[PDB]
């Protein structure tokens, strides 16, 4: 039931940001993110 498929690539999930002349979003919490970067 497997096959090779061909498709137009997606660029990412789409998102309308809730902009208004008097609205702000402020983060009530945080995460600490450790990410690895490899260089020759």
């Amino acid at each position: 039931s497997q096959s090779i498929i061909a498709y137009t690539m997606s660029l990412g999930a789409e998102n309308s940001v809730a902009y208004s002349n008097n609205s702000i979003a402020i983060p009530t919490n945080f995460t600490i993110s450790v990410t690895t970067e490899i260089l020759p």
Partner: protein, 317 residues
């Protein structure tokens, strides 16, 4: 940010329509495979370079249907829906100001992985993220803020007190709208403004033109045409004349692949710089002097161009 991807059939360039020349070219071993590995290593990184510059955005951000940006008018730089590709007004100037017989010599040009529509969608998401959420979409999820309240944070970033925005906001909006007006007029009128991108296209074209012209050269053989050598001479004298054309053609290819490898390193350094200006000038506000234009950096807007990127850098002077 990128240059044209090319690949070559080394056997068709050197020996096109000749079994005799192809059977002599086997005496040289790996070189025709090694040339194709070089041109592939270049072509694979033109897609890398483009994706490192533009694909810095997690999600395809969209602008609101109401453009209440506090008087700042982005309509010259935001997407225009009445088009087959949703480019901005300024992006359609940039795509007109750069202007872009080889094939049957075994040479071919490969398409980029991201189409000009996909580069425009990434640029739209970078611009729509910036004007709705400031720097916050670079460091987390996009958090909305009013645009004049973002520009007050940007004024604090240059050491100017935020009432100097709110008490002068109509002047600041009119000066931005008048400065984006002059960007259109400059780009429309002046030819040499995109000289950096036209020079890359001109260098790629002059290199392929020179590569094809080297087929007409004798290299000291009795003709540049394999059929003349093969019709006029016997096996053992024709194999001495055909080897001159193989030797000179194979050096004509090795010279092209070397100048292409050397030139791909210049384009990569420029793509790595353009990716750094995308991260530091578009997704942020920069304290690095003269990095994001002359003045004190407020913000920058990306626009795509043929094989490159344009940053419209906004500064307090």
């Amino acid at each position: 940010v990128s240059m044209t991807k090319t690949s070559v059939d080394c056997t068709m360039y050197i020996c096109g329509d000749s079994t005799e020349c192809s059977n002599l070219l086997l005496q040289y071993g790996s070189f025709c495979t090694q040339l194709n590995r070089a041109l592939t290593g270049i072509a694979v990184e033109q897609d890398k370079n483009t994706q490192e510059v533009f694909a810095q955005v997690k999600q395809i951000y969209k602008t609101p249907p109401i453009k209440d940006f506090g008087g700042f008018n982005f309509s010259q730089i935001l997407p225009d829906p009445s088009k087959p590709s949703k480019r901005s007004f300024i992006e359609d100037l940039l795509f007109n100001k750069v202007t872009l017989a080889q094939k049957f010599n075994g040479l071919t040009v490969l398409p980029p992985l991201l189409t000009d529509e996909m580069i425009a969608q990434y640029t739209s998401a970078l611009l729509a993220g910036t004007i709705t959420s400031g720097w916050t979409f670079g460091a987390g999820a996009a958090l909305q803020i009013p645009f004049a309240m973002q520009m007050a944070y940007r004024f604090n970033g240059i050491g100017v007190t935020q009432n100097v925005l709110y008490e002068n906001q109509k002047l600041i909006a009119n000066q931005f709208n008048s400065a984006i007006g002059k960007i259109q007029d400059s780009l429309s009128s002046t030819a040499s403004a995109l000289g950096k991108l036209q020079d890359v296209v001109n260098q790629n074209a002059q290199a392929l033109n020179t590569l094809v012209k080297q087929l007409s050269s004798n290299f000291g053989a009795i003709s540049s045409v394999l059929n003349d050598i093969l019709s006029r001479l016997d096996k053992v004298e024709a194999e001495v004349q055909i080897d001159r054309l193989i030797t000179g053609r194979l050096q004509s290819l090795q010279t092209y692949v070397t100048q292409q490898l050397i030139r791909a390193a210049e384009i990569r350094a420029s793509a790595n710089l353009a990716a750094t200006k995308m991260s530091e000038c578009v997704l942020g506000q920069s304290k690095r002097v003269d990095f994001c234009g002359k003045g004190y950096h407020l913000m920058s807007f990306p626009q795509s161009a043929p094989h490159g990127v344009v940053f419209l850098h906004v500064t307090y002077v």
